[PDB]
Amino acid sequence: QNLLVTKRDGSTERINLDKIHRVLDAAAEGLHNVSISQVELRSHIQFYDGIKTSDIHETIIKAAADLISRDAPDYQYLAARLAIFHLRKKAYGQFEPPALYDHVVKMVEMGKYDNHLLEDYTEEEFKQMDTFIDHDRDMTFSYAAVKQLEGKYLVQNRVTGEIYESAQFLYILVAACLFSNYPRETRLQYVKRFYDAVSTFKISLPTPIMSGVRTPTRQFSSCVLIECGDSLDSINATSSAIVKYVSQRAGIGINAGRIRALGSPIRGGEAFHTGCIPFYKHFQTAVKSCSQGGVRGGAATLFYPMWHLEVESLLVLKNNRGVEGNRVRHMDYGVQINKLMYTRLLKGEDITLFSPSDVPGLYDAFFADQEEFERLYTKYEKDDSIRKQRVKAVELFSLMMQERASTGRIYIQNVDHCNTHSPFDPAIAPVRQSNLCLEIALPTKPLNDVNDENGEIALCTLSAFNLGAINNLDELEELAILAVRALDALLDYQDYPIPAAKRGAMGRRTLGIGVINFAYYLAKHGKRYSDGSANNLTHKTFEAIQYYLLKASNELAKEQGACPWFNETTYAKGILPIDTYKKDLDTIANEPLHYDWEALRESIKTHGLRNSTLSALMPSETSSQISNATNGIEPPRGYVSIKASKDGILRQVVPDYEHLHDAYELLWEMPGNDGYLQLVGIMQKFIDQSISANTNYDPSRFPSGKVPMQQLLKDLLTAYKFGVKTLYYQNTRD
Amino acid sequence: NLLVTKRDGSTERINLDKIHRVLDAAAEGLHNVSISQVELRSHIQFYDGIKTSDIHETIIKAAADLISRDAPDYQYLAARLAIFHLRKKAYGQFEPPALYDHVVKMVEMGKYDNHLLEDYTEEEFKQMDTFIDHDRDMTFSYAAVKQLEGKYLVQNRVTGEIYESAQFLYILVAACLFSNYPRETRLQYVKRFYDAVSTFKISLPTPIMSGVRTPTRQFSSCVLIECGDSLDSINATSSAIVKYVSQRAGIGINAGRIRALGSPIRGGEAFHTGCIPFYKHFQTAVKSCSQGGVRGGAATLFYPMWHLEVESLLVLKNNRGVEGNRVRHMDYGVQINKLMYTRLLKGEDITLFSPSDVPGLYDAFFADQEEFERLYTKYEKDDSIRKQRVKAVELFSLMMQERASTGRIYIQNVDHCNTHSPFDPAIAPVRQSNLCLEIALPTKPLNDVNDENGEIALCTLSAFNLGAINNLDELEELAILAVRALDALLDYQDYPIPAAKRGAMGRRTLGIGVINFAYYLAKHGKRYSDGSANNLTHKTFEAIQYYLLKASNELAKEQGACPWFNETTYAKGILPIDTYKKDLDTIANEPLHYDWEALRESIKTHGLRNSTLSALMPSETSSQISNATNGIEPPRGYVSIKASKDGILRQVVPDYEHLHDAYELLWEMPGNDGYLQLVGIMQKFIDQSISANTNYDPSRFPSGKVPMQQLLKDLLTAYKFGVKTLYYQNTRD
């Protein structure tokens, strides 16, 4: 041994294991069941003569990263702190970060930070904000979290790979930018409170916000909903609108249900329609227009009513079989269903297929007035002049669920629930569609041109509360104030490439805040998914969420004024989510209301809301790993998730596995979806928009190794029974 | 004995004398036709209770099957029999009703435009009815009548009812186009144009024949769109395509300006994903209004050979490869200039650039060839500019290889499209072409679908029937009728896109070609390959262009020249006889027979109503009407067999009885050398381009495979004689 090492400056000195052993001790503080000697054993054997000190540092990182297991979960924090150490050297040349002001100035000169930081904050104000920063909080990240920070969030050079900042400078400047326009009387106060909220992992922020809000970029929109009209001018506008947003890396929600069916006459019969599929293809290439091949890049979800005439051709657009002429595979789909459609299924009757051009007012009423829909639907069924097609409800629903089973990307949206239990008046601004992940339900209006100021493209800013980072529900009051005010300030911060999109964003100021670490949240309270023991807890939890969110936005409307289009909301008429929820929820939950909604109701009727929507439960796979949380409301598939990477295999252990290893309920440890869907329904009672609920099935739990069709339709009807608005993925175990 | 079923529902015993009465009336003046032979094959198919309509359709098909080389006049027998039935379906009798009574009835039904009764009085309709000779319906061939019944004649697409005859079509097309003409000469022009199209002297496009009298105003069938290097332009181009393919029009897309894969955006805020993902977006725009996504409309996308992704764009049509790098449902046209061919002959390399990294290289590539070579070599010597070196021999081989397999990879010599052009390259250069590569018009990219600063090139088509004229001096009258009619259509048709109307109203570009050229050489006893038609072609197409220009020139004296005439070479007194490829002087010694110098001074002073007039387009539909050969292309056989809904339709080449040995079939030709020489001579006078085809027979080559050496031989041969574009490459199987 006694080999030589290579320092950073190029120098060379005899190896000193005491220096390595000294570092490992500083990264193992407070950790349990960790062996420094075991790390050194796996590290020393890899050492060679003339080794770089940087390679030595990465060696003890990977060596500790491989020791991440169920038996010793704290190795994910050991390798993390070791990774933090190296990133300090890469960005600063030392451990302790420079002064906040000295950092910003240097970065602005390089052109990595926005210059408005030095314009909106003085040097003295930067000194005060630096005191808020606790750089020791970087030791609270997990190993999987650091890899996410180093690769996605932290400002860096995409060419050389140099890191230019740490995790704490990220949080303090995101807070600095969002509240930069606040008066100095309260500006620095909000900056501190919001910083401590996101640094202690109480509020989770989306990827484009974490890696953007401090950089010169202003592209923060990642959720786009576009409704397409039945005209070439509208299709061209929709297509152009897609290209503009997928170029900014945004999820697209397309509503092409208005497009008339194949064979439908045009201009009295001067020409005849060629089908929706040729236009669906045009939308797909628009989405894949900025993808290095047409496979990756961006994705979208196209929506259409079940009673559409070509519905038998649209459901089978994703299956691998069939020719390219009748397949549009690289997009997802969401079939829109209402009460009358399910009724025909239960009664085993038929479903009459119409083209939305041959049935006047049938489409609009399909979303707004269900009573008017059933009137028009039955009227046009008995009409022999209207072109139609008869298909049995049992077969149609079976075809839908069949393709949903194989592809797993065919989604369901109960549109009647999206307007009967909605924050919007269906008579003024109805919800006719959703987004990519089916958690967004916002009003839309078709565009006659890409720059049409009469259309409306729905945008929504996302965020999430971390239920695993709060000790009680009364903390949400403070967190809601910080979350809403920050996102609302971002709306006036970001840019809008399409005029019709800015109209909706400035008009309604729609927000969508969800939750993460819900699985771990049930584990702490000793609850589960399937048994239905978390029903009362869920009702208590999401009540506190929605109440404090509304209260935060309501007080914000007193300060800066309500949104311009607030009169188009149900809140303006004094209608709360606790008034229009699915009454079938009363049979699965008896938890009482713990907050004064009636006082809130009068406060909203008088002062209004800053935002038309506030709550929306979205999936979180990237933002969750930062706080070491479970993916949204979904249960973990295992105690330890294994994901390969550029620096080897990354392992992430569920939070507090040492004390809750039996408290957790894995995905495939569940009997069925009945317990899960009931919880979703209870959440939906308070959630303004929708929930990205997933259906799960294990072929091994069913005879002949196949999931029966009777079970699929059962859970589907079960979901609709409890007021579930949307259904996302269908996970099939292999 | 047996009984037949009348139209009214009645029933009468069969009368063979009635059928023999009809057949005799349809065989008048015909030679080598046997009425008894038709009756022999017709009577045996008869059954009791047969409908008279089925009887009529039986004797038609029976006469249609007897169409052969030995007796070519059967094509007129079955035709006249088909005409008879169409008279009954539309009028209920043989003799058509009065013109005025017909129009009024049709307008009431909403099949004709009401502006016919507004622009013409009852007395004027009576005068036009005197011009109509309904006996001319007996001059159509069987293949021609079938085309009338299915494409041209106004009908109900649901019930299948015919609402008019062929003569009402011609007289009302003439009536509408000249409806705005002064009373002094209006009916005078109506008659002359009627006699021109009814005697098959002037051939008109499908959308004109089936449109100009109906309430529709969609007559644009030729669209050229240039795409800029921006999302705003790609979206605009996409929107522009969809609206025009919805009107059934051919699209010419120029997506050469789109920067290559990896090119930096806004200094490097984002990086390009390639041209191919955008090509797919253009394709679905084309196939957006197509039954199933396969039929409907088609387009041709153009890109320069020196483009960086040229190795990826050349192989977009082959059946091989994954879907990620294939765009098969569109045709392509590689743009080549002098420097590219020079690198080929010297066996050197071709440097590939992205049009975003080479300032002014794209513009000079079309406009200034001298400037191009300067910039190309300069940017070649620069090591800071991203580039890629590929051998000229290999690049050309890859191009011709995919052209050989697909037959849809086209070639456009852009240097010839501006050195020998009716447009000033410094003001309005030709940067692209159309679907069939016969159109060469200036274009400007759109920053929006409704951009008033962009320019979408449109062109109205037509053709002279060389087999229907007795001399070349007849073209003087025909050009006057042709140009004035098409120019009037420009103010008649609608424009769904502002940028398209700008080009149409500004330059008023026309494109008149020819049909029956193969039969034209047969009458004069000339051929393609031997080069015996070189001097004849030079004489013919001179008379075409001269009489075309002279017609438009005097039209400019009457109604004023086109607004953007100052951007033409004609304005500076430059004629096609001044800027042609000088290599043509070695293959033709035919002198000019017309006073061009008098025309030259008349153009400098009074100008031209139209910036362009001549363009040789393919004609497969309009040619069958006049029983002509498909454009300038030679026939593949003496009799063409084409299946249909009513059986097998047979068409015999014109005057086969006297010219069976005079003709030169397609596969009876040694090579393309004889053909390309003729095309080169035509290009000397043609304003735009020619849809020239290259033909090859694997049986005439050893090992049953066409050598690459021959493909490059004919390609360089074409460029040598100033051939602007190359269309199909027909490979015999």
Ligand SMILES: Nc1ncnc2c1ncn2[C@@H]1O[C@H](COP(=O)(O)OP(=O)(O)OP(=O)(O)O)[C@@H](O)[C@H]1O
């Ligand atoms: N006070 C500290 N607490 C925790 N980690 C530290 C501290 N100071 C430095 N580090 C980190 O420990 C690693 C080594 O630090 P440092 O350069 O001070 O010591 P060394 O490399 O072991 O020895 P040498 O004096 O030869 O440089 C680096 O990744 C650095 O960021």
Ligand SMILES: Nc1ncnc2c1ncn2[C@@H]1O[C@H](COP(=O)(O)OP(=O)(O)OP(=O)(O)O)[C@@H](O)[C@H]1O
């Ligand atoms: N003078 C004519 N010259 C040529 N064709 C004619 C003439 N008169 C009629 N025809 C056509 O010949 C066909 C038969 O004519 P027509 O109806 O008068 O006689 P028919 O059918 O044999 O007997 P009928 O109708 O009296 O029972 C029709 O298609 C009609 O248009």
Ligand SMILES: Nc1ncnc2c1ncn2[C@H]1C[C@H](O)[C@@H](COP(=O)(O)OP(=O)(O)OP(=O)(O)O)O1
């Ligand atoms: N002489 C040495 N022998 C063995 N390990 C060493 C030696 N010096 C440093 N190390 C260890 C300490 C850390 O775990 C790891 C990385 O040290 P690091 O401080 O980043 O590099 P460095 O010491 O060469 O540069 P610097 O001069 O900036 O401190 O290497």
Ligand SMILES: Nc1ncnc2c1ncn2[C@H]1C[C@H](O)[C@@H](COP(=O)(O)OP(=O)(O)OP(=O)(O)O)O1
């Ligand atoms: N030529 C065409 N071929 C195929 N589909 C077409 C064609 N033209 C339009 N379409 C499609 C696009 C739309 O979905 C629909 C026609 O709608 P639109 O663009 O508004 O036409 P329009 O307004 O002129 O007539 P309409 O009164 O029938 O709506 O049919």
Ligand SMILES: Nc1ncnc2c1ncn2[C@H]1C[C@H](O)[C@@H](COP(=O)(O)OP(=O)(O)OP(=O)(O)O)O1
């Ligand atoms: N009784 C008959 N026996 C045999 N052939 C007949 C008879 N009547 C007519 N034809 C022939 C004449 C034509 O060649 C062919 C089609 O006749 P067509 O004139 O179109 O119908 P039609 O005679 O039944 O009605 P219309 O009274 O309108 O003339 O049938």
Ligand SMILES: Nc1ncnc2c1ncn2[C@H]1C[C@H](O)[C@@H](COP(=O)(O)OP(=O)(O)OP(=O)(O)O)O1
């Ligand atoms: N996000 C994107 N992903 C992929 N391709 C893109 C993206 N944005 C633009 N493109 C394409 C479209 C154009 O061909 C080209 C950029 O041109 P353009 O739309 O005019 O952008 P720009 O004007 O903002 O920047 P530039 O100065 O580089 O042209 O790259």
Ligand SMILES: [Mg+2]
């Ligand atoms: Mg060190």
Ligand SMILES: [Mg+2]
């Ligand atoms: Mg319309």
Ligand SMILES: [Mg+2]
């Ligand atoms: Mg009759």
Ligand SMILES: [Mg+2]
């Ligand atoms: Mg640009």
